[PDB]
Structure formats: structure tokens, C-alpha cells
Amino acid sequence: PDPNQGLRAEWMRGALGMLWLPERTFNGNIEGIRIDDFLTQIKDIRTVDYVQLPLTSPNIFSPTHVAPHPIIESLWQGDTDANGDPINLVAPRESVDDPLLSWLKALRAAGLRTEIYVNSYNLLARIPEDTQADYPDVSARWMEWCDTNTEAQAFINSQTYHEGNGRRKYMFCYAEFILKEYAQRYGDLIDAWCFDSADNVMEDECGDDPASEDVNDQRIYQAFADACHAGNPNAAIAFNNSVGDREGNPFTSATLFDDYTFGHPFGGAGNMVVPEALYTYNHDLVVFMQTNNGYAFRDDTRTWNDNVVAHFFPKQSTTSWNAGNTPCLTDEQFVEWTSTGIVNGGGITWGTPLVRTNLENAPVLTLQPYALNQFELTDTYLKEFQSPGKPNWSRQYTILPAIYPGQPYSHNLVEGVDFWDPEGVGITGLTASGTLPAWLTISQTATGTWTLSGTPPVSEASNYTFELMAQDSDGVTNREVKLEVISHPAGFTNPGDGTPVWFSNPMVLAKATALDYGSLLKLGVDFYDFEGDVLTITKTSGPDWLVLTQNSDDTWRLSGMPTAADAGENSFTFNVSDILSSDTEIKITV
Ligand SMILES: [Ca+2]
Ligand SMILES: [Ca+2]
Ligand SMILES: [Ca+2]
Ligand SMILES: [Ca+2]
Ligand SMILES: [Ca+2]
Numbered sequence: 001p002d003p004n005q006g007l008r009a010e011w012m013r014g015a016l017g018m019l020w021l022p023e024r025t026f027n028g029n030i031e032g033i034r035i036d037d038f039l040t041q042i043k044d045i046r047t048v049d050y051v052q053l054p055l056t057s058p059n060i061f062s063p064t065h066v067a068p069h070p071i072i073e074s075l076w077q078g079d080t081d082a083n084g085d086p087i088n089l090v091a092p093r094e095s096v097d098d099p100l101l102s103w104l105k106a107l108r109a110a111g112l113r114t115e116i117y118v119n120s121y122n123l124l125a126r127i128p129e130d131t132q133a134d135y136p137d138v139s140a141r142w143m144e145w146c147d148t149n150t151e152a153q154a155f156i157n158s159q160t161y162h163e164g165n166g167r168r169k170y171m172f173c174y175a176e177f178i179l180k181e182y183a184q185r186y187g188d189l190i191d192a193w194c195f196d197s198a199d200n201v202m203e204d205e206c207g208d209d210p211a212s213e214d215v216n217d218q219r220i221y222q223a224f225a226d227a228c229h230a231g232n233p234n235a236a237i238a239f240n241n242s243v244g245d246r247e248g249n250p251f252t253s254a255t256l257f258d259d260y261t262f263g264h265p266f267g268g269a270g271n272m273v274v275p276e277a278l279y280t281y282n283h284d285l286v287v288f289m290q291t292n293n294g295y296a297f298r299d300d301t302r303t304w305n306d307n308v309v310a311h312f313f314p315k316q317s318t319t320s321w322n323a324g325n326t327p328c329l330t331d332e333q334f335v336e337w338t339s340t341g342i343v344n345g346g347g348i349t350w351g352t353p354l355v356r357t358n359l360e361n362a363p364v365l366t367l368q369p370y371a372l373n374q375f376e377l378t379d380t381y382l383k384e385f386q387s388p389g390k391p392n393w394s395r396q397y398t399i400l401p402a403i404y405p406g407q408p409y410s411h412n413l414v415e416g417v418d419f420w421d422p423e424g425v426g427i428t429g430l431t432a433s434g435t436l437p438a439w440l441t442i443s444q445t446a447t448g449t450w451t452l453s454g455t456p457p458v459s460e461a462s463n464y465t466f467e468l469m470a471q472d473s474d475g476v477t478n479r480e481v482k483l484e485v486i487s488h489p490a491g492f493t494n495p496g497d498g499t500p501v502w503f504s505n506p507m508v509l510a511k512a513t514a515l516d517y518g519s520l521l522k523l524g525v526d527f528y529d530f531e532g533d534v535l536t537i538t539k540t541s542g543p544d545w546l547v548l549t550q551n552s553d554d555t556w557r558l559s560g561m562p563t564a565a566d567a568g569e570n571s572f573t574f575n576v577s578d579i580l581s582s583d584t585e586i587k588i589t590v
Pocket of ligand 2: 297298299300301304305306
């Protein structure tokens with residue numbers, strides 16, 4: 001077996017996780033969507049370690065991806081609706097946006113690891129008898145591509161174990177061409193993969209056996225696992241092979257390629273903790289993680305699965321994992337369930353509910369107020385009790401800002417935010433060790449606030465990796481940090497006076513029609529600031545139809561319906577500011 005099976009998910013022991021999952025991502029709906037509102041909302045939640053994002057959506061939405069891919073995008077064939085909106089487009093366009101990349105980098109910037117949801121049916125149809133109006137021909141076109149493509153047919157014939165029951169060869173094609181490409185593109189930005197509906201497609205239809213410990217019985221599981229590991233060899237994999245046994249071991253036995261347990265709770269649909277017997281069965285799963293120190297399969301007659309990490313994927317609301325207006329647990333219970341499961345135990349991806357997940361029906365992609373409240377109480381508990389004694393650091397990473405050669409550097413590490421004393425006495429001091437830059441300096445500017453400051457020279461062009469050391473009465477705790485020099489984008493000229501600049505003047509965008517427009521303005525593509533100052537954009541003149549709205553610090557969305565009188569050549573003036581500013585003309589033919 002694999003010697004690092006489960007060890008690569010060692011960080012998941014004691015890990016608190018959330019879920020951010022929009023719905024109805026197809027046909028360009030996900031393009032321009034950002035997670036930055038959600039992350040700003042949870043800025044004070046400091047013990048949280050990771051967030052699960054989708055690559056695909058669940059159930060019949062498994063073909064719909066939230067990241068671009070040439071092969072998936074070729075299945076579109078420019079097909080349109082009655083309104084003119086896309087149909088059979090089950091991924092964002094390469095020319096328009098890569099939303100998943102923005103969320104991955106924003107999560108990394110926030111000091112968090114990431115889990116990636118993939119439904120195992122992927123581009124195949126879960127119910128072939130039915131027809132999905134928004135993407136009806138995609139499943140057929142994907143299979144059409146697999147059996148009529150030189151590289152794909154060559155791959156299918158390269159191993160004897162590809163051919164078999166049902167749509168087996170097509171599953172291998174997704175792993176090789178789609179999943180591997182996604183994995184290798186994003187690299188270490190993805191820390192984990194959870195594969196839903198695995199036994200449904202892999203075991204029952206395609207004829208693998210996840211209960212076995214022969215690799216010849218688990219080649220579809222291998223292909224998916226190796227495709228992830230080709231991009232990041234430390235990426236923890238988990239397969240949903242249904243729920244285990246409520247009386248004994250609650251997790252279904254690990255395959256040869258499970259680093260952690262998927263951990264679907266008992267009573268899938270409906271409220272997972274009603275009646276009292278269902279509450280107890282799912283709480284026994286939480287207690288099982290405590291009892292076995294976060295290792296799922298120490299009990300059985302297999303030593304190769306002893307490092308596999310016990311992990312649970314419950315839902316915070318009463319209805320769904322990604323939404324719901326009612327919490328299933330009380331405030332006291334939610335803190336107990338979480339702490340019992342992770343504190344010297346396993347990991348939990350909480351199905352944290354957003355206010356409204358449907359992108360077509362006025363989406364609000366931030367946590368329910370009651371859900372945030374439960375995490376605030378959990379945060380206060382885990383700050384004190386998860387790792388008592390020496391100081392604890394926040395989340396998984398501490399991210400220092402990039403080095404701008406010549407410019408002043410300044411970043412505060414605040415007590416209570418980036419580090420804290422569990423007992424609540426206080427931080428006695430903060431120092432560093434290792435190869436620091438000569439210019440860089442640590443000092444306590446105000447009470448409970450240490451500042452990493454200094455001014456790099458213009459010739460600064462190297463990386464630095466060193467330890468930060470938070471100290472209190474009980475002892476001292478280390479935290480590795482990185483300092484990288486900024487890489488400016490191509491096609492941008494530095495004015496050398498602090499002025500933020502547009503890409504060009506004029507700047508023409510795509511054409512519009514009288515009845516909705518859609519276009520994105522992005523940092524480093526359409527506008528840029530060489531000091532890295534946060535920017536503001538304002539429409540200062542032009543026709544009324546063009547609506548401007550900010551999605552994040554680095555993304556702005558242009559929208560709105562042109563009237564009959566707006567046909568021709570519409571000119572707008574757009575400003576970009578930080579004190580200093582500069583205008584530009586933006587033309588749009590209609
Ligand atoms: Ca933590
Ligand atoms: Ca064992
Ligand atoms: Ca639509
Ligand atoms: Ca202490
Ligand atoms: Ca500036």
C-alpha cells in the first residue's frame with residue numbers, strides 16, 4: 001500500500017471546516033462570483049482551519065463546473081436560449097473568468113486550507129432517463145468526445161482495466177483529462193478532495209469494490225486519487241462510500257486511496273438529529289472520533305489504514321448542507337459537538353448554511369446570522385480549550401503582505417487575531433528567528449499589537465522563510481511565515497508617482513444588445529496599482545443603462561439592460577483611485 005496514506009491528512013486532526021457552496025452555476029452564472037464577502041464576515045473567527053469549495057455541484061448538477069476547461073467548454077458549441085443566454089455551458093469561459101482560482105487565493109490569503117467537492121458522476125448523467133433543460137446535450141457530448149478523440153481513445157486502450165461495466169471508461173477519461181488538469185493547475189492551493197456519490201457510480205455501476213484491499217478491484221478510485229496527487233502529492237482524498245455502522249464503527253471502511261473518511265451522517269435527507277435516537281447515533285460518531293484520537297480504523301485487522309484520519313461532514317441547518325433557515329443544534333450543543341469531535345480528535349467540515357444559495361434568484365452568499373453566532377461561541381471555546389498552555393496561532397497559515405521594492409512595508413499582528421494566550425493572561429512578547437531581511441524589523445507599536453515594518457531597497461529580489469515566536473507564561477510557540485517579492489502584471493506602465501493606472505485609453509469591451517449585459521473589470525488585467533493600494537472605481541459619465549457594482553477588492557462587474565435609444569457607440573468615462581487617480585474612456589458598441 002501507499003506509505004503516506006492518511007499521514008498527508010495529519011493537519012485535519014483538530015481541524016474546523018466550513019462549506020461555501022453556491023447553486024445553479026451553469027451557463028455563466030458563476031462567472032465573476034466572489035467569496036470575499038463571506039471571508040470578511042468570518043474575519044473574527046480565528047480557530048477555523050479550512051473551507052470546502054465546489055469544483056462540481058451535487059446530484060444532477062455534477063456536470064456543472066466552477067472552473068474553466070477547454071474540453072468542457074468545447075461541449076458548449078455556442079448554444080443559446082430564447083433570451084440569448086448560454087445553454088449546454090457547464091463551466092466558466094477561459095476568456096471571462098476563473099472563479100475557483102479567485103476563491104482559492106482568497107482562502108489562502110485569509111490563512112485557510114481548502115477542501116474541494118467533486119460529485120463522482122462528474123460529466124455523466126446521474127439519471128439518464130430525465131433531461132436537464134439548462135444543459136441537455138452535455139452528458140452525450142462528453143461521451144461522444146471520449147469515444148471519438150485520438151488522445152482519449154489511445155488512453156482508454158492503454159490499460160485493460162479501463163473497459164468494463166456501465167460507463168467505466170468515461171470515468172477514467174474524466175480522471176485523466178479533466179480532474180488531473182484541474183489538480184495540476186491549482187497545485188498546493190487545494191489541500192483536500194472529497195468525492196461524493198463514489199460507491200453509487202464506482203462500485204454499483206462501474207464494478208469496483210471499495211471493501212476489498214486489492215488494487216485491481218479499486219482502479220477507478222486509484223485513477224481519481226492519482227489525478228489529484230499529480231497536482232498536489234500531499235492532497236488528502238476521501239470517497240463517499242455511504243454511511244458505516246451506527247452501532248459500531250460509524251465510517252465505511254477505507255479504500256486503498258482514502259486519506260480521511262468522507263463521514264456522511266446517519267439519516268441523509270431531513271434533519272440529522274431528530275428524533276433523539278438519530279441525535280445519539282450521530283453524536284456517537286462524534287464521540288468515536290474523540291475516543292480514537294481522530295484515527296478512524298485503528299480497530300480492524302488492517303495496519304495499512306491506521307493513519308487514515310476520522311472526519312465528519314454534518315450539516316448545521318435542519319434541511320441542506322449549504323443553506324437553511326433553522327439550526328439543527330442549539331448554541332450549547334453546536335460547541336459541544338464540534339469540540340468533542342476535534343479537540344484531540346478528528347476533523348469536521350461543517351455544512352454551514354448561507355442565506356440564499358441560488359445564483360438565479362437574488363443570491364446572498366454569506367452565512368446565516370444564527371450560523372455565524374454559533375461559530376463565534378465555538379471560537380471562544382476553542383481559543384481556550386483546544387490547545388491549552390502555550391500560545392496558539394490563528395487558522396492554518398499566517399500570511400505576510402508581499403514585498404514592494406522601494407516602498408515602505410508595514411503589517412500588524414494583533415493579539416486576539418493572529419495569536420493569543422488560551423488562559424487569557426496575555427502575550428509576554430513576540431520575536432522572530434531564522435534568515436530575516438536586513439531591513440525588516442519587529443516592534444510593539446501599541447498594546448497587544450506587534451508590527452512587522454521596514455523599507456526594502458529597490459534591488460530587493462529574493463524570498464525569505466523564517467519563524468515567528470509568540471510567548472507567554474506557559475512557554476513559546478512557533479509559526480513559519482513567508483515573504484515574497486511582488487510580481488507586476490504584463491502590459492502596464494509604472495508612472496512612479498503613486499498613481500493607479502488603467503490598461504489603456506480608450507478601452508473597448510464586448511458588444512451589447514437592447515434586452516442584459518455582462519462584463520468584468522479585474523485588477524492586473526484592466527486596471528493596476530504598483531504600490532498595491534486598495535482601489536475604488538467610479539462611472540463618472542455616459543449613458544444610464546451601464547450599472548457598476550463591486551464584487552471584491554480585485555473585481556468589478558459591469559451589467560444592466562440597454563434601451564432602444566442606446567444603439568450605436570456608447571462612451572463612458574471611468575475613474576480609478578486609491579488620493580491619486582486617473583480617468584479613462586471606455587467605449588461599448590451596441
Ligand atoms: Ca484550529
Ligand atoms: Ca487498523
Ligand atoms: Ca438563466
Ligand atoms: Ca497560557
Ligand atoms: Ca498608489
